[PDB]
């Protein structure tokens, strides 16, 4: 492989305590003579899948648990195997956070939740509601202060307001992944409130992490919204601060997405046993977690013994209070796509580039794109291969899925007829005989669909070849390969054609384009 044997490379995000982590690395090095290198690459959560897909990158990757499902789904992570005794050392619900398709795919480290951080000298009694913040800002502006500044470039920080009055990502009721609440009335109310803060000069659409942090730590703004990792810098600034429950919106609690900081092991690492040793017997201990925490606070750690100490901290009690009012992030593979969609929506709404209504509409479509495409393509491939339709209800957004499939059947019939010779030739050239061969199609399909003008014609041709291949797989008693084929084609489609698909209003555009 490309990853070096007999050493550890560890990537962690730039806002975390990577110097403290490096100290843990140093102790491991001292014991074993094996080098540990910690890096905090820019755009880490995008850089990791890029390099890991080529079999490269770090042995150990740190991020909140939400990204790890996509990584696991892409074959980038080793299954991890803590023995029973080690597992019992961490809270069961943190392990739940790192389970994907019934397998553990990461070590959970700490539970992160946003809180309201406030300056006790400017604001001894922080607002219980978002609604009183405009008036508070007007008072403070008379003194050359502002009420509130927080990062407007990452949706994570605005989500708690979006979800307060009813917005949600993927319906969690004891998951309906088809049920997406990104553009419902509650989500629009929350984002509209944020946009009005900006229009009324109570916030600035350009504000990012660095700018908000600096304004709070310099005592220019009375409040910020941030996580435990930020407390270290505030301590240094000597601002007299407090950490408390987020304001309510429309009488409802703000609901932060709760993240579990987690460490995965690169599927292509030759050092998996070393990584296991490092994570289990050096990092996930009282002294290991302490060393990181003293650099930048981790939040509420997954390790029972050490959390029992940290829980006495009023800042941590506050973190857990907010965490309990929020929801643990899903780790389904399309979480990245969801975050990309909401990110664009908040940025576009805040800048006036789009209205709130249209911005969230696009985020809705972007977030729904994977599951809806998979439903359409899976159903088409399966019915094409068996000759009979699936009579199960389509579920949520059923009209769209049903009409798209009806359109695909009609248009797809002609494409397959006209491409029969081409399809037969390409099938024989590719030699698809089993689930292993199916795995090899992804790189091929990506290369083809990363170039050229996009249109519905070319998309239908791909799905039609999918159906052709599915029929073949059925015929040679490899009917079990059809669903991973459908998943792979869907994955290539929504990845390479994301922006174009959203601009078409997803499959609704497809239906309209081939209307009769």
Ligand X SMILES: OC[C@H]1O[C@H](O[C@H]2[C@H](O)[C@@H](O)[C@@H](O)O[C@@H]2CO)[C@H](O)[C@@H](O)[C@@H]1O
Ligand Y SMILES: C=Cc1ccc(C(=O)O)c(NS(=O)(=O)c2ccccc2)c1
Choosing from 362, 368, 375, 487, the residue that interacts with Mg ion (CB under 5 A) is 362
Q: Shortest distance, CB of residue 377 to ligand Y, whole angstroms?
A: 12
Q: Which of 20, 57, 69, 259 binds ligand X (CB under 6 A)?
A: 259
The smaller minimum CB distance to Mg ion, of residues 265 and 349, is found at 349
Q: Quickly count: other Cβ atoms within 10 Å of residue 249's Cβ.
A: 23
Place of tokens 């730590």: 217
- Closest separation between CB of residue 429 and ligand Y, Å? 8
Q: Which residues, in sequence order, are bridge partners of residue 214?
A: none
Closest CA to 225 of 261, 189, 249: 249
Residues 6 or more apart whose CB falls under 8 angstroms from that of 474 comprise: 385, 386, 482
**Does residue 170 interact with ligand X by CB under 6 A?**
no
Q: Does 255 bind ligand X (CB under 6 A)?
A: no
Supply 70's token pair. 């996509």
Residues 403-432 that bind ligand Y (CB under 6 A): 422-423, 426
Residue written as tokens 């041709």? Answer: 461
Instruction: Specify the residue, 271 or 354, whose C-beta has the smaller distance to Mg ion.
Output: 354
Q: Which two tokens stand for residue 47?
A: 């850089």
Piece of 33-41, 130-138, 154-162, 378-386 that binds ligand X (CB under 6 A): 154-162
Number of Cβ within a 10 Å radius of residue 425: 11
Q: How many CB atoms lie within 10 A of CB 193?
A: 20
Assess 320 for contact with ligand Y (CB under 6 A): no
Q: Applying CB under 6 A, which part among 172-180, 270-278, 337-345, 457-465 lies near ligand Y?
A: 457-465
Number of residues that bind ligand X (CB under 6 A): 12
Least separation in angstroms between residue 156's CB and ligand X is 3
Q: What values do phi and psi take at 337, rounded to 5?
A: -65, -40
368 lies in the site for Mg ion, by CB under 5 A: no
Q: Which is nearer to ligand X, 177 or 405 (CB)?
A: 177
Judge residue 391's burial from the number of C-beta atoms within 10 Å of its C-beta, 0-12 exposed, 13-18 middle, 19 or more buried. exposed
**DSSP-based three-state secondary structure for 323:** helix
Residue from 28, 48, 118, 156 in contact with ligand X (CB under 6 A):
156
* Residue 160 interacts with ligand X (CB under 6 A): yes or no: no
**How many Å apart are CA 385 and CA 150, to the nearest integer?**
53
Q: Which does 465 bind (CB under 5 to 8 A by kind): Mg ion, ligand X, ligand Y, none?
A: ligand Y
Q: What is the distance between the alpha carbons of residues 433 and 472, in angstroms, rounded to a whole number?
A: 9
Tokens of 409: 């059947």
Which residues here bind ligand Y, judged by CB under 6 A?
422-423, 426, 441, 444-445, 448, 461-462, 465
Which residues here bind ligand X, judged by CB under 6 A?
13, 15, 45, 64, 66-67, 112, 154-156, 259, 339
Which residues here bind Mg ion, judged by CB under 5 A?
362
């Amino acid at each position: 492989g490309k990853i070096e044997e007999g050493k550890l490379v560890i990537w962690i995000n730039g806002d975390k305590g990577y110097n403290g982590l490096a100290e843990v690395g140093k102790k491991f090095e001292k014991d074993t003579g094996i080098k540990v290198t910690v890096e905090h690459p820019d755009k880490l959560e995008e850089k990791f899948p890029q390099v890991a897909a080529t079999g490269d990158g770090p042995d150990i990757i740190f991020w909140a648990h939400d990204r790890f499902g996509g990584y696991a789904q892409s074959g980038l992570l080793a299954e991890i195997t803590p023995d029973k005794a080690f597992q019992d050392k961490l809270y069961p619900f943190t392990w739940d956070a790192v389970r994907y398709n019934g397998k553990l795919i990461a070590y959970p480290i700490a539970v992160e939740a946003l809180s309201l951080i406030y300056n006790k000298d400017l604001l001894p009694n922080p607002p219980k509601t978002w609604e009183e913040i405009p008036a508070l800002d007007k008072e403070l502006k008379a003194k050359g202060k502002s009420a509130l500044m927080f990062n407007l470039q990452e949706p994570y920080f605005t989500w708690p307001l979006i979800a307060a009055d009813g917005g949600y990502a993927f319906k969690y009721e004891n998951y309906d992944i088809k049920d997406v609440g990104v553009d419902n009335a509650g989500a629009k109310a929350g984002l509209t409130f944020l946009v009005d803060l900006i229009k009324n000069k109570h916030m600035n659409a350009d504000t990012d992490y660095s700018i908000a942090e600096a304004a709070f730590n310099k005592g220019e703004t009375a409040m910020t919204i941030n996580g435990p990792w930020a407390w270290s810098n505030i301590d240094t600034s000597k601002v007299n601060y407090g950490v408390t429950v987020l304001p309510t919106f429309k009488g409802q609690p703000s609901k932060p997405f709760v993240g579990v900081l987690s460490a995965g092991i690169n599927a292509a690492s030759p050092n998996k046993e070393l990584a296991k040793e490092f994570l289990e017997n050096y990092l996930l201990t009282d002294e290991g977690l302490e060393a990181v925490n003293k650099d930048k606070p981790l939040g509420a750690v997954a390790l029972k013994s050490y959390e029992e100490e940290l829980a006495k901290d009023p800042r941590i009690a506050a973190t857990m209070e907010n965490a309990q009012k929020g929801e643990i992030m899903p780790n389904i593979p399309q979480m990245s796509a969801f975050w990309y969609a909401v990110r664009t929506a908040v940025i576009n709404a805040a800048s006036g580039r789009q209205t709130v209504d249209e911005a969230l509409k696009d985020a809705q479509t972007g977030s729904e794109l994977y599951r809806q495409s998979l439903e359409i393509i899976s159903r088409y491939l399966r019915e094409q291969a068996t000759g009979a339709a699936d009579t199960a209800p389509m579920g949520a957004s059923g009209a769209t899925s049903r009409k798209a499939l009806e359109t695909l059947r009609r248009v797809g019939d002609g494409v397959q007829r006209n491409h029969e010779t081409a399809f037969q030739g390409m099938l024989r050239k590719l030699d698809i005989k089993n689930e292993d061969d199916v795995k090899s199609l992804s790189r091929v399909m990506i290369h083809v669909f990363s170039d050229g003008v996009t249109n519905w014609g070319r998309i239908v041709t791909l799905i039609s070849f999918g159906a052709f291949v599915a029929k073949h797989l059925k015929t040679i008693n490899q009917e079990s390969c059809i669903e991973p084929l459908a998943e792979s084609i869907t994955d290539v489609l929504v990845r390479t054609k994301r922006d174009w698909l959203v601009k078409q209003r997803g499959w609704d555009g497809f239906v309209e384009f081939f209307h009769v």
